[PDB]
Amino acid sequence: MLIVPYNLPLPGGVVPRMLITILGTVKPNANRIALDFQRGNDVAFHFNPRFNENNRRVIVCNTKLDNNWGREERQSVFPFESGKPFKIQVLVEPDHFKVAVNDAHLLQYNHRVKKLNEISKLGISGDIDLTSASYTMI
Ligand SMILES: OC[C@H]1O[C@@H](Sc2cccc(Cl)c2)[C@H](O)[C@@H](n2cc(-c3cc(F)c(F)c(F)c3)nn2)[C@H]1O
Ligand SMILES: [Cl-]
Ligand SMILES: [Cl-]
Ligand SMILES: [Cl-]
Ligand SMILES: [Cl-]
C-alpha cells in the first residue's frame, strides 16, 4: 500500500479537532515504529513503540529541539503485536495530542511545541506495512 518511510503533509499545521488515522500491520519480529510530527527539523511529538528494549516492550514519546531530544515520557501499556494489524488515531486537543490504538485510549502528550500551525508534516517509519494515513476534522 504505502512506502515507508512515508511523509504525510499537514497543510497549515495541526489544530485542535484534527484527527490523524494510521492503518498498517506490524511486521514479523518488528523492532521499532515511529511517528514524527515535525516542525521543520524539530520533532514536536515523537511516538515510538520499541519492541525489544532490554527485552521489554515500551512506547517512548519525546520532542526534538535544535537536534536535541528532551525528557522522555514512558508509560507501560503496549497494544501492538508483531504480525498484527493496527489502527493509530492521534486527536489534537487544545493542550495535548491524544492517542488511541485499536479504538482504546493509550496516552496523552502535552504540547511542548506551541506553534501548532507550523507542525506541518507527519513522518511514519519503522517495521510496518503501511496501509493508509490520512486526516479529518471532527
Ligand atoms: O527520546 C526518543 C529518542 O530516543 C533516541 S535514543 C536517545 C539518545 C539521546 C538522548 C535521548 Cl533523550 C534519547 C532515539 O535515537 C530517537 N530516535 C528513534 C528513531 C527512529 C528512526 C526510525 F527510522 C524508526 F523507524 C524508528 F522507529 C525510530 N530516530 N531517532 C528517539 O526515539
Ligand atoms: Cl507511497
Ligand atoms: Cl514541517
Ligand atoms: Cl498555532
Ligand atoms: Cl523506515
DSSP string computed for 14-74: --TTEEEEEEEEEPTT--BEEEEEEETTEEEEEEEEEEEETTEEEEEEEEEETTEE---EE
Of 48, 75, 88, the one to substitute when testing ligand 1's pocket (max ligand atoms within 8 A of C-beta) is 48
Place of cell 492521534: 90
Task: Report d(CA 37, CA 8) in Å as an integer.
Answer: 10
Which grid cell sits at 83? 504480525
Nearest to 70 by CA among 83, 79, 61: 61
Assign domain 1-138 one CATH number from 2.60.130.10, 2.60.120.200, 3.30.310.50, 1.10.10.970. 2.60.120.200
* Contact (CB, 8 A) for 42 and 134: no
The percent of the chain in helix, strand and coil, each rounded to the nearest 5, is 0, 60, 35
* Contact (CB, 8 A) for 4 and 127: no
Listed residues: CB within 5 A of ion ligand 2:
2-3
Task: Report d(CA 35, CA 44) in Å as an integer.
Answer: 11
* Contact (CB, 8 A) for 34 and 130: no
Q: How far is the CA of 133 from the centre of ligand 2 (A)?
A: 10
Which grid cell sits at 18? 484534527
Task: Report d(CA 81, CA 30) in Å as an integer.
Answer: 9
Please indicate whether residue 62, judged by its CB atom, sits closer than 6 Å to ligand 1.
Answer: yes
**Cβ atoms within 10 Å, residue 6:** 17
Task: Report d(CA 10, CA 119) in Å as an integer.
Answer: 7
Task: Provide the residue ranges of all domains of the chain, joining segments of one domain with +.
Answer: 1-138
Q: Is the peptide bond before 5 cis (omega within 30 degrees of 0)?
A: yes
Experimental method: X-ray
